[PDB]
Amino acid sequence: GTFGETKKVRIQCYLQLSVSVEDIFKKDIFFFKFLLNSSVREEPVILYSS
Amino acid sequence: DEPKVKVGEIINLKIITEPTSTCRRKQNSTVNFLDIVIFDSKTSKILPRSNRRILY
Structure with missing residues (x-):
């Protein structure tokens, strides 16, 4: 009876990145502006691709 | 490269740095x-x- 019970893990619920959207209108073309930052102001984020 | 850009050309700028x-x-x-x-040609201080x- 392999009991691996009571692994008392604590998990966090805070999405660390934060994305702000800005829709620049233009004639026959379009532009998206994207402000990306961290959730809280002591945990910095690295980014790899978008 | 090629300073005549019409509207829609995403164009890389190249910087070469060398410490003295x-x-x-x-x-x-x-x-x-x-x-x-970023400066305007006539006016100054683009936000x-x-x-x-x-x-960019």
Whole structure:
């Protein structure tokens, strides 16, 4: 009876990145502006691709 | 490259940096920071959010 019970893990619920959207209108073309930052102001984020 | 750009050309800018003979001076900072700033030809100080302008 392999009991691996009571692994008392604590998990966090805070999405660390934060994305702000800005829709620049233009004639026959379009532009998206994207402000990306961290959730809280002591945990910095690295980014790899978008 | 090619300074006649119409509207829709995402074009890379190339910067070549070389530290001088005063590379011997400081050396306790190992990183320095390079703000690229944007001026109009006639007027000055384009704000860095920069809509209807260069987007980066």
